[PDB]
Design a binder for these strands. Structure first.
Ligand SMILES: N[C@@H]1[C@@H](O)[C@H](O)[C@@H](COP(=O)(O)O)O[C@@H]1O
Ligand SMILES: [Mg+2]
Length: 90
RNA sequence: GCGCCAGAACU
RNA sequence: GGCACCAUUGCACUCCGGUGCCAGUUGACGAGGUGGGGUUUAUCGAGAUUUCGGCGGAUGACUCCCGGUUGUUCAUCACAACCGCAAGCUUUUACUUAAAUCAUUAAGGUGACUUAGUGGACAAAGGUGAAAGUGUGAUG
């Protein structure tokens, strides 16, 4: 269902860890205040990002507005997080 | 036990 | 660590896919040490994944010299150890800021690491102060 964290995939893998993290904050800041954006370049986690919002309302607005948006020459694919994040759950 | 850095090791 | 190529469209919350090329970083912690030449593997502990390995230096050692000093009064010689502004040797102590490692804290770096601090200390060789026993022979 809905979640404080949104799962993003289909991201450009050629972009380094912190540059992506800062460019993602550049867009998702308008929907609500972001707690953290978790990015990893491992085989299992590359081209993926976890933006953690404080409110669920900010996650839904981000999911609705940024879906299919071209980001680094690639259209974004946004879902909700399957489970809560460690900053939200604990 | 003083200086350097084509190996080696580490990132 | 970058960069390139290949593989990868996944649901994470501590650093984790291959392959090449190209960089970067470390790389001796103090204590002590220089009459001239020759030869050489250049003293002492502390620490310990590299204080490894390679290059350069080097006050060491050995040996032949030059010049001294001691060899328990003096001098000339040979002989032994010793000094090189010091000086026979065995034998005891104390003193001569140990520093780094270790433990941490800040600053810088993507990182390996770098710089600067702080804390606790811990040597040996040499040298010196003082305490014990002995130094070669022949001689004008
Ligand atoms: N004091 C040291 C010597 O003890 C050592 O013999 C020399 C050579 O260094 P290495 O150990 O690299 O041969 O360097 C220094 O001079
Ligand atoms: Mg040094």
């Amino acid at each position: 269902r809905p979640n404080h964290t949104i799962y993003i995939n289909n991201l450009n893998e050629k972009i380094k860890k912190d540059e992506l993290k800062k460019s993602l904050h550049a867009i998702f800041s308008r929907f609500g205040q972001i707690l953290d954006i978790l990015v990893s370049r491992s085989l299992k986690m590359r081209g993926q990002a976890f933006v953690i919002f404080k409110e669920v309302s900010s996650a839904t607005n981000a999911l609705r507005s940024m879906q299919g948006f071209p980001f680094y020459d690639k259209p974004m694919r946004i879902q909700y997080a399957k489970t809560d994040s460690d900053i939200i759950a604990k």
